[PDB]
Automatic annotation (TrEMBL), chain C:
One of its GO terms (biological process) is defense response to virus. The keyword Glycoprotein does not apply. The keyword Cell inner membrane does not apply. InterPro entries: Cas7/Cst2/DevR_sub_I-a/Apern, CRISPR-assoc_Cas7/Cst2/DevR, CRISPR-Cas7/Cst2/DevR. This is Type I-A CRISPR-associated protein Cas7/Csa2. CRISPR (clustered regularly interspaced short palindromic repeat) is an adaptive immune system that provides protection against mobile genetic elements (viruses, transposable elements and conjugative plasmids). CRISPR clusters contain spacers, sequences complementary to antecedent mobile elements, and target invading nucleic acids. CRISPR clusters are transcribed and processed into CRISPR RNA (crRNA).
Automatic annotation (TrEMBL), chain E:
This is Uncharacterized protein. Disulfide bonds join 62-107. It comes from the Archaea. It comes from Pyrococcus furiosus (strain ATCC 43587 / DSM 3638 / JCM 8422 / Vc1).
Length: 107, 336, 335, 336, 108, 107
């Protein structure tokens, strides 16, 4: 449900094979209480796409797959109705949990 | 003399009391949970904080600094001159003075008479079993509740990464196989409005815990084991340790961060007797609670003297309009 | 006289009453299991709770500290001045006062006449019995069930790590082979809105346990073996000992933690006769329980004075507004 | 002999302490979050800033530059002559002196005796465990609060693109297939009025931090492992290191940006004994706080000397007006 | 409202490859829109680059970019006019700022 | 809508066809700081009206929609109540935002 594709991209900011070690964005998306800071944190996570692309290309392993624009609008289309923070926390921590999986990228 | 201080401090771009080690990349700042309203039921949020151990250690540093210059500065542990807080660790029976003289940890009276740091800050001697509760107590430096409610969580945290330029003598930046250490490491820097509360129990200085009184004349005369001048000097040393405290010397990474301090407001009370603890500055309604506590304590028969900076308090009770921290400690030492 | 207090207090960043950790590098805060509804389900949660022994000891500390100021404060045990209080045992039949006077434990009357801690907080004399129960009792300190229901998840328990750096004679340091003291331990810090409840039966101070009344002249007058003046002094000291409890002076790790304390709400009832405790503050509906219990007690013919802080408790009941715990103590010391 | 300096400087068309980019054609200026009071309630704003680490590095550069000319200038590290700030990286137990001699790292006294950079700016050798806290404390350079009030952000930043022209012998730009390097990168340039604060605890130069005193006859005396002339030279060099810092030699990209760097105003204090730190120049109400601190500290008996540039500080405080930073350092070196 | 995606598709052209116009500053400024004034200003700076991308896309064999229609501009003006609360303004700005980075298939 | 028509006219200064590119006047209108600057920018924008009117039929495009007198007058008395740049900058940016839209100038 459009979580694996964004989850692996989020993991791309944590894997040891990519020596940039951006844990602040993962902490920010994980510790989200309402809509605005969650969207801001996911925007900061998604902003590092050129860095990851030009670092993977210079290394040799296949480039990371940025989330496709078809599942981008799903994020707001689902989170607009999440007024209650209790239900928001579910996905706010699920994304961070997916960001810490193995996700073998560069062989 | 017993004194309590509580207030707020503005503080931005501070990497104080981090978690990770120096050699580990991405040094992380400490986090602590707090409970707030957010216009509904109770909710817990995770915010950067400074532990009370850090504050207590920097109070110890300031006290040692201000007690060295006194004529009784010889009465100090050799570890104190090194700012070493390990007071009588596990597996030792004797300690070394500042001048090199040895002291035996058999009784508390001689320990507090000859060693000043172990008297103000307490000590533990597991090998012998001796005890002394610290006279100074400190709380956490938590961001104030109304500030947390007012910012809706922009994380108050910036992870800034930077590197050293360790290079070979020939001018080549080698890899890990060469021996160079040109690597990037990240430090987390916090910001916001914080609250602090430290209590001092300087009325028991120079008095052994076991035998507070001796009853020489069938009356409670305190068991002052040291000279009154030494006890007094220890008192203003502990009181003057607050001047480097509320100036930017209660944090780590001072060489590269040196936190940007400005005390916003505070209240201090002292009555040379038993005193209720003030309300921590973390709560948004601590001014009214402190005003009520002061008023009821004074009406109950306590000789509370109150100095306030940047708070209106009650406007009807006798409170001194102090202008800064060092003026406050000057007023405190004028009433010894 | 006979007083009962129950309410809710906010305290965070505290490690009061931990497991000590005398053999392990990790110090665990106290925990207990609690059952609560989960919208048609009896779920169980592990939440920190301060034991009543801690509160009893800290109230004793406050009482012995406030009893020294009074001119009648000589009548105390040598243990009391050191915040001791083991209070004898199977091998001791002699009490040493603050001035060092031998006191026999033959009867409770002399024990309560010459000692003040033994009078209020009880004692035990295995040699001849003479058991005296504590006049002040305290309950545990649990977060309210409303808080537990509303948080559901979340840990509110932080394991914060502290080091003990020990620089050597020049600048060196060692881990475990140089004999120095350089370790890295951890402490558990809790938060939440806790509930407290204490019962003080101060109406029996100075009266021997075995002889509540003398009944000699055909009047059941109280058997006060001591002078009324220092009996009143003991009452005032015990009532003032409440002030250095609801301010942050309860628990452990006071030097490094000093919990961020703020009393939220409370209800207290005071009377000159035997009265029942209202309800613990852990329950969500404890305010209505207090209202019902005070109405029922007043229906049976009881003279109760009720003080409320940050709680309405209805309008029919003539309750006294309380600005702070010290206002309550000042109103109480009127008797 | 301790010094505290604070004030405000106006920077235009500067790109000091950027984020480097690393492997991309975009280079961003470093950002940090600061808390601003505002009449509408507390807010957090991300603003460009210069980290205190680079400020410390440039002070180290100035100190080395002014200590090289000193006759005692041979007592430096070979890395210091190259402005290499790394202090005894992990795995090495020896230090190469400027003259080529080898210095062991088993003793702190020798290290501070024949290595001036480690003495002044501190060091750490993880292999042997020796350490020394730096004597210089540097804080972040942040735009002042009232400036943010008045400008309402405006993004305070431009992005200027520079080409990378690779014209070969034939005169062609290429198509990234032959080996040409014709590209187009961009750099971020900021502007505004910033505030700075610097602390120099020049009282432990040549004095090991383990045994600061000797106590010959229970009479405190500094434990100096070097002759007093070297102490005087090191202190003078550290003081003069401020000249190539307030002239515009702070930060990176000096060859292509060279910040405009006018010093707007400043206040400094200096005293032989320990003194509280001055208020950072970020806050709008920092002149009044500094004035109160100075007045009350002098009332407490601290023999402090105050030098003010473009700040009045009223009449009660006995302060000497100073025309520029050069005159300030001249006055500072006048009183040893 | 359907125009957020329309304007995000245009904003994608300022960051995407095969265009050599790496305008990260304007995208970040739109994302950091504290007030409505600077949000509109950043949108104007982003729109000013329309002719450059429009000509370069056909100069390198790519379909012309979908410059937002005047209806989208009218809707944006209405939203800016009726939103005086920073609470909603921040999420509004982030909504169209997030679309800049994606796996858009601009050039087949 | 009293701003859409002025923006429609301003879009003639830059678009496909209508080979007369005037970015400086659009920037001056958009970057207006004082009321005089905005008025001068509007005057310079209107100065090119005869050029566009004659060039419209020179390429077969419909004649341009020159703003009526009434909205120009209304703009003149709407300018004379803005005592701060706060509102004036917003008005200028709103006016200039329509210039770079996907107008159907001449099908």
């Amino acid at each position: 449900g459009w979580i694996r594709n964004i989850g692996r991209y989020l993991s791309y900011l944590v894997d040891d094979t990519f020596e940039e070690y951006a844990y602040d964005v993962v902490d920010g998306i994980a510790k989200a209480r309402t809509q605005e800071e969650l969207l801001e944190g996911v925007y900061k996570a998604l902003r590092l796409a050129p860095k990851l692309k030009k670092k993977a290309e210079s290394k040799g392993c296949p480039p990371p797959r940025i989330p496709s624009p078809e599942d981008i609008e799903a994020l707001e289309e689902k989170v607009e109705q999440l007024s209650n923070p209790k239900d928001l926390r579910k996905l706010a921590v699920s994304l961070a949990l997916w960001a810490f999986a193995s996700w073998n990228n560069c062989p | 003399m017993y004194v309590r201080i509580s207030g707020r401090i503005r503080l931005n771009a501070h990497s104080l009391n981090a978690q990770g080690g120096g050699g580990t990349n991405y040094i992380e700042i400490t986090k602590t949970k707090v409970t707030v309203r957010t216009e509904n039921g109770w909710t817990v949020v995770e915010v950067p904080a400074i532990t009370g151990n850090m504050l207590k250690h920097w109070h110890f540093v300031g006290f040692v600094d201000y007690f060295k210059t006194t004529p009784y500065g010889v009465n100090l542990t050799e570890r104190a001159l090194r700012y070493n807080g390990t007071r009588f660790g596990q597996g030792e029976t004797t300690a070394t003075k500042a001048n090199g003289a040895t002291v035996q940890l058999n009784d508390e009276a001689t320990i507090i008479k000859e060693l000043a740091d172990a008297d103000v800050h307490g000590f533990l001697a597991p090998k012998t079993g001796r005890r002394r509760v610290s006279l100074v107590k400190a709380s956490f430096i938590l961001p104030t509740e109304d500030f947390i409610k007012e910012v809706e969580g922009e994380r108050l945290i910036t992870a800034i990464k930077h590197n050293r330029v360790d290079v070979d003598e020939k001018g080549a930046i080698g890899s890990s196989k060469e021996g160079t250490a040109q690597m990037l490491f990240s430090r987390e820097y916090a910001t916001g409005l914080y609250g602090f509360s430290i209590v001092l129990d300087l009325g028991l200085v120079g008095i052994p815990q076991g035998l507070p009184v001796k009853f020489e004349e069938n009356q409670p005369r305190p068991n002052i084991v040291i000279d009154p001048n030494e006890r007094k000097a220890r008192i203003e040393s502990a009181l003057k340790a607050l001047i480097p405290m509320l100036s930017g010397y209660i944090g780590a990474n001072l060489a590269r961060s040196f936190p940007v301090f400005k005390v916003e407001e505070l209240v201090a009370i002292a009555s040379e007797g038993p005193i209720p603890a003030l309300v921590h500055g973390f709560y948004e309604d601590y001014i009214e609670a402190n005003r009520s506590i002061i008023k009821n304590a004074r009406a109950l028969g306590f000789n509370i003297e109150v100095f306030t900076y940047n708070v209106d308090l009650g406007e009807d009770i006798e409170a001194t309009k102090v202008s800064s921290v060092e003026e406050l400690v000057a007023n405190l030492v004028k009433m010894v």
